[PDB]
Amino acid sequence: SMNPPPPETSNPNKPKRQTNQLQYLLRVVLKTLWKHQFAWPFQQPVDAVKLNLPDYYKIIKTPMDMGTIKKRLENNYYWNAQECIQDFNTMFTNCYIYNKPGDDIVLMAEALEKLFLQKINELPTEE
Numbered sequence: 001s002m003n004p005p006p007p008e009t010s011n012p013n014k015p016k017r018q019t020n021q022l023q024y025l026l027r028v029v030l031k032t033l034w035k036h037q038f039a040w041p042f043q044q045p046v047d048a049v050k051l052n053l054p055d056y057y058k059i060i061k062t063p064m065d066m067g068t069i070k071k072r073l074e075n076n077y078y079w080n081a082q083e084c085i086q087d088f089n090t091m092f093t094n095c096y097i098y099n100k101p102g103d104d105i106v107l108m109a110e111a112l113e114k115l116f117l118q119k120i121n122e123l124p125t126e127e
């Protein structure tokens with residue numbers, strides 16, 4: 001029923017890059033999903049105490065959220081775009097695992113994922 005430590009967003013010994021694909025993941029992908037009317041449940045780690053989800057972290061062992069992704073992008077945490085794309089997919093999958101089909105949070109994730117997929121289809125060529 002307690003919250004775990006959040007996912008890592010800082011690690012000075014992890015090697016980093018600033019690349020056109022990662023810039024697209026911030027400027028297009030994250031910004032598109034973040035401004036959406038359904039973003040709010042996904043803008044920070046799941047707070048199992050506040051939201052009365054005492055079993056969430058019993059079930060979800062690889063937590064992820066757009067607040068974490070935003071910090072990772074803004075603080076140049078990544079080496080490559082695949083790492084960030086995986087974080088988005090982990091976030092959506094966790095929601096689909098934890099919740100019932102057609103629940104409001106699942107419809108919200110699905111709408112964000114539809115936009116995500118459209119933007120990833122247009123991921124720029126690596127320069």
Ligand SMILES: Cc1nnc2[nH]nc(N)c2c1C
Pocket residue numbers: 041042046051053094095098099105
């Ligand atoms: C991301 C997330 N996923 N599953 C959920 N179930 N109920 C919630 N409040 C909730 C949230 C915020």
